[PDB]
Design an enzyme around this catalytic site. Structure first.
Site: not given
Ligand SMILES: *C(CCC(=O)O)CC[C@H](*)CCC(=O)O
Ligand SMILES: *C(CCC(=O)O)CC[C@H](*)CCC(=O)O
Ligand SMILES: *C(CCC(=O)O)CC[C@H](*)CCC(=O)O
Ligand SMILES: *[C@H](CCC(=O)O)CC[C@@H](*)CCC(=O)O
Ligand SMILES: *[C@H](CCC(=O)O)CC[C@@H](*)CCC(=O)O
Ligand SMILES: *[C@H](CCC(=O)O)CC[C@@H](*)CCC(=O)O
Ligand SMILES: [Mg+2]
Ligand SMILES: [Mg+2]
Ligand SMILES: [Mg+2]
Ligand SMILES: [Mg+2]
Ligand SMILES: [Mg+2]
Ligand SMILES: [Mg+2]
Lengths: 319, 319, 319, 319, 319, 319
Positions: D191, D244
């Site tokens: 991530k 991600k």
């Molecule tokens: C990581 C992002 C947390 C944050 O920074 O709020 C976990 C959730 C990912 C969602 C991706 C999106 O839809 O931006």
């Protein structure tokens, strides 16, 4: 946790997991053909090996095939040795007669024929000598006609042991031109300049080999150069590629098999053969055990074909 | 330039270059044992296959080993099926009696024993059932005792076909604890949720198999997951790993052999066997030729051991 | 720590991780076209398979395309079989008419056409026979005109199943010369000499195939030689390369996909098809389950295209 | 010689050779749950996305599963935010209530639950804050309890998005201890510290995110470090690993699939989603076509699971 | 033991280990040149993008080079569109004038020129259309003269975006023949049939593109086919090979870099650009952050050159 | 174009390109020590090899080191053989006396000591015998004490030739416990069940070797199993790994060097040595040339250390 000895506990487990096995289909018997009728001369430096007259090679080939041997490699010993080596491509040559005779008697047998000028010239070299230099291109043109000569007599495969540059391609061009696109080529792709070739050189009575063969035969120290050599022959169109010598060259065999997607052949040389034979005569080793173990070693290394003088004795045990 | 047909022009050349061969030493014969004395029931869905009594099983093993077969894989059909499957680790169980009888009569034969709860439980699954869920760890604990039970009877190898997680490591632990660290494990490492096991299911009379076995047996669509499954099993200490089913899974067999450096086993399943058998009875295929070719295909894919119901027939032809 | 069964606990998890899926876009339906009008003959050794007259193939191709099948493979059965096989390249040939008719009726369908002399000659061979030798170059020149003939009638792809050396290159030269550089070639790159081709040989009524086809078709034992064969065809210009047979050859399929960056095709052969059909007739297997599982096995092995006689039945289930 | 356009000449050929395809089984729909009854708030920065009440979330899941979607990913928006984030492991928490309600109504659907402290803490970070430092081990200990909490409510999978070191192994340990060894872990293994998460941030109303998250989320410039991150997570026992963000990170997805032999998941982030949505509203792009192509791109990169807010729309088109 | 977060603890550590960085030397600015004097038209679907008259492109190229941009990609918008597209190779063409003018004013700048018939024909295709078929060879012969035309005007590199088979080789032959062996070729090696090209098509005012471009442009699902496509162009003699589109195609970029030993280029397409621009207009994303992050993503994926409409804005930030 | 003979045209060129060379630093001399004072018995089956007394062994080592040999491998011949083999770990044992004497006289020489129970037990096996079974763990426990015994006498390295499972790890553990963590282990990792050990067997007078040693020594047919054996030994902590026998096993040597990143050792076995020696006595081969070429072959195969009985002769020639 891990105890490998579990796969060795019994004969009934060792056979199941056994990665490789030697068969009669892995064996090729080399045959030396001298001129004359009804004569068989034992090679003094190769006990069990013989020089064969055409009529006696024919009968030997019966015994060989009946034991289940699929291929033979023919070596010629001419009555006349000439500096230009023109007897090599004589249609009435002792080698050519042998091919023709054996093909008539045992049609189902694969006749592989040696393509080199070694026993056909006074200098004892695989090629033509000028000012001490064993020539390349001039030799190959003689080699072209030699391979044609063999195919003409009815040979199945030609096995050029010359170690000249680009001979395999030229021989392929030469054989294709003379309606023999179906006659195969077993290249001696990585033949090394070995001190193991002794007993073979007196067996073909080849005249004093003069200076050594380091101008064309590979340096026994080289591995990478064998990979370069094999590839050139495959691009040139070789059906089968051989490494020579055998036992102390099993590393090159492995590299050739793992990298080239082409049947691999190996030569169980006279010196290796004479080594096992001399030590067994003293009682220091068991001939049968060492000969078969060393043949299995070649199958483990990745060889498919083994040119061996023990082929017939090996054939008898695998019956 | 390139003509591959040169290596196919004659039977002599095809045999020399042939990359892989089938031997009697690549064959294991699965044997079904039922309770009673002197009775041989033929399986309706597997023509040629038989349910054997301990005494006639011995009779078969004499005939098997004399043909040159090195290993057998024993399956037991118990008189009684219990929900806890406790008969699996019964020391006087039919499976245990068969091991002990065969090992006395033909000691030079490798006895491999199936370790699964399939024919021992009314639910017809490889493990213990609770609320429709086939339990993992609770099953393995029963399997541990089962494998120990076989070793105690005289088994050489145990072949766990259960497809429970971490069963092999635990079985290794359980076998090592009970002074059987010399008894091997042939893991059904990549066993698939197949529809080819029909004829095997009625052969062992296993009661209504219920819902399918997709909760633990591998998805037929998965390749990468077989690599994950096999590794865990090797790290756990399997001596041999198996891919099941056979014919339609030769890609997995090749992946396992090219990546893991451990003897690879394969199962020639009852469905494959019945498929050849039913089509041959109509005269649409040649039985002998298809059975042998499919066995050669498995050796080519890189298998070393082949569990096949045609093992005895194949042994007769390779003799 | 590692419990793989977690990805198998539910149907809702098995579908997510499932590495491979079978679609209608993976299926090609082979079609046998015989002469005559309004006649459909069921193959005695292939239940569910039919011989089609041109007018009936046209209507079948409607039903095939409406189910979502993208390609068909056309096989011709001529009224006259000649030693020179000249009917193969007849513009008024039954095959040529079929191409022309189907292309008119269902333009959106991809017509792949067989390029072999098997059912066009009395000897039952893929090529021309002289003194018992199935000729190479003489055959390919006939094959050149055959592929031209197909492209002329309006074919999309030509699929040469002959297994002659260098035919793919020559056909590419031949098609390029006659303004068909846009007509593709699906090479039968690694077609093995199988005993699984039974039911196909009686379906095309091809006259007694005389001696076996081991002079050109691959030895079922060979893996490395398939890699050599495929590469030659890709260098020659093949758009798609096929491995044949299918199920018991999934290892070769995997090797071809992992190494060549070219669409991979596979043949679900008559013998495999007859095996599933005969065993289901006995009630030993479930036809639907085994046919679909085996098709998924091919997708797992890395095939993109599957020539299968179950294509239409498979198409109906994937609707 | 080579003309690749041959495989593009018709829709019939393009479909046969098409390397990758998008299915409903590759889709997971993320779902935001807020406190209250019977209310659906649309996200301003994500048109089409909605904040759902537990009762309307159930309503959505019926609609989702009926379209063929196998998995959902649940996010909770708590009424109260505390510095210790204890509401995350509250058994009567909104997230837990949603799990328990959805699992009752639609049991055949896979419930995946977000394990992060982002919307539960006023600082807006994934972990616990002390002196401006987002703590690692102190966070994981809270995450352990959170994951256990979800499993207790009835979750099938837990998807930890925290990017703390060694969290997965500890969560695995914590899940195994509490009799949930059958509950999986979908790790956010690689991530990245991205600026694409804007629209997701206001959707969960997470309080002022403070300074950026570069102390734990990966640097967008790093490739080799994703390989290091993913491995540690697999050794720790992750069943699925995720990359991600999505679109602009397909290289990492390809590296993960080619190297790790474990199902690969991907997140189609809110920014990507808002980007397509905003440009389509101006009429500069086609919404349907871009959303579907981007989803196909992810399958091509070698992903198996796709977390996407377009999941329901995509499901409708693939129906 | 392993805590990766140690390399992220501070800005002073993240910069040290940072695997990749974006520089001005990675940026190429595409320039649209329309006819006329002193006029600059903003693209309605690409805010910040402009159509430039020759005199205004010259001055823009000053500002571009002074910011440190090394290369530009020229696109022509002709006053007359013809079915044969002969204006493409007109020496007095607007594109040719632009090359000549810019080379005079800013000699140190690298002028890359588009070689496609897209905006030069009424059908809106990269090639010549006959009966609905976009021709291959007929197009390339026009493309040959076009590249010559560009080199004649003084261009440094030609960048053919046509996606015709074997154009790169022919253009190399064409350029070598006309004394331009020093003018390079940036092949659009793997250009996909994308729905992301919207805003570019209205920017060049190209007439209605009729049917889609799936006959020549790559299927967005294909990975292996891109590897085949790139290699052909490298064998043909391409100096630089490009993948298009960009962000959602970073996996193809990685495969091309890891396998081909040749500079890799990428296209930050109009649709990606319009997506960031539209979402920032709504306030859902930060334009600056997303544009730069996505450019760094391309450098991480292995691109060396980035054709981007944000190049000048990117140049200003990297000053 | 390509002429490899160019690098063979002169001794000047051959020496520059020579891939591998033999040095005195690649040689280890095995030394047999028997009880008594001032006696040198020549081995009948190994001409040139000698049984040495501790005092004359010292004499030899002065001569050895002065020629430049860095390491010796010591074998003891005990006056008494016991079934428990307790003399192996006797602190006043002949082996221990030889270590202690040699280390005093020539301290700059590396003393490697054989760790095996072969000459210490009447059964002539490497381990302890019970019911015809050569025991594993019971043997290793004796070997642990043996290795400790050598370290106590002053040994630098221990070379365990036993081929028991997990012996190396246990020896490492045993050596570390007794403050000898600085004493190395040269494992006979892939030692084969060879028939080449004849002349070595009578040299150490080892009593009737009984049945063969196939229960623990590797099958000469196995390649993949050497890779499995070597790895376990490296994970256990071997500093150097050995392949035995030598010449006919150079493929295994190459596999070990290309895969393991650890110094590779090799044994030039007595059989190989006797083979050269017996054939040279007949005048069929040149002793000096064959012995040196075979040693070069081993260096080429990728070995770094060579245990050879020709070590002193070879050292003289390289001086
Ligand atoms: C990581 C992002 C947390 C944050 O920074 O709020 C976990 C959730 C990912 C969602 C991706 C999106 O839809 O931006
Ligand atoms: C797996 C199948 C168990 C079952 O489903 O009954 C272990 C035994 C394999 C036998 C293969 C066969 O012959 O079908
Ligand atoms: C292995 C052989 C022991 C035996 O069988 O006697 C360890 C010693 C190797 C010596 C090789 C040789 O010289 O034969
Ligand atoms: C190669 C070597 C010729 C020579 O130098 O004698 C051609 C024949 C090889 C067999 C030699 C052997 O058997 O040793
Ligand atoms: C290859 C085999 C020809 C033959 O030997 O009959 C050309 C057609 C293949 C399909 C055969 C099948 O369906 O079994
Ligand atoms: C390729 C695509 C032509 C088209 O279909 O418009 C040549 C130019 C690429 C840039 C397109 C973009 O910026 O989106
Ligand atoms: Mg050569
Ligand atoms: Mg398992
Ligand atoms: Mg071919
Ligand atoms: Mg991590
Ligand atoms: Mg191209
Ligand atoms: Mg060991």
């Amino acid at each position: 946790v891990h105890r490998p000895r579990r796969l060795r506990r019994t004969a009934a487990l060792r056979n199941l997991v056994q990665e490789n096995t030697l068969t009669v289909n892995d064996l090729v018997f080399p045959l030396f053909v001298m001129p004359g009728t009804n004569a068989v001369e034992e090679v003094s430096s190769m006990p069990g090996s013989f020089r064969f007259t055409i009529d006696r090679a024919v009968e030997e080939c019966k015994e060989l095939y009946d034991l289940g041997i699929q291929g033979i490699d023919l070596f010629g010993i001419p009555e006349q040795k000439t500096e230009d080596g023109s007897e090599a491509y004589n249609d009435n040559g002792i080698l050519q007669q042998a091919i023709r005779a054996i093909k008539k008697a045992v049609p189902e047998l694969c006749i592989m024929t040696d393509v080199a000028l070694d026993p056909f010239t006074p200098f004892g070299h695989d090629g033509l000598v000028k000012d001490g230099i064993i020539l390349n291109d001039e030799t190959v043109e003689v080699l072209q006609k030699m391979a044609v000569s063999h195919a003409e007599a009815g040979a199945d495969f030609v096995s050029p042991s010359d170690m000249m540059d680009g001979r395999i391609g030229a021989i392929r061009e030469a054989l294709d031109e003379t309606d023999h696109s179906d006659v195969g080529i077993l290249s001696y792709a990585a033949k090394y300049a070995s001190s193991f070739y002794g007993p073979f050189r007196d067996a073909l009575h080849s005249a004093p080999q003069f200076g050594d063969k380091s101008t064309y035969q590979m340096n026994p120290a080289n591995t990478e150069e064998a990979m370069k050599e094999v590839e050139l022959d495959i691009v040139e169109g070789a059906d089968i590629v051989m490494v020579k010598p055998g036992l102390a060259y099993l590393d090159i065999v492995w590299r050739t098999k793992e990298r080239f997607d082409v049947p691999v052949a190996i030569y169980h040389v006279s010196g290796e053969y004479a080594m096992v034979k001399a030590a067994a005569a003293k009682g220091w080793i068991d001939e049968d055990r060492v000969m078969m173990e060393s043949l299995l070693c070649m199958k483990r290394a990745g060889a498919d074909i083994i040119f061996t003088y023990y082929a017939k004795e090996a054939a008898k045990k695998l019956r």
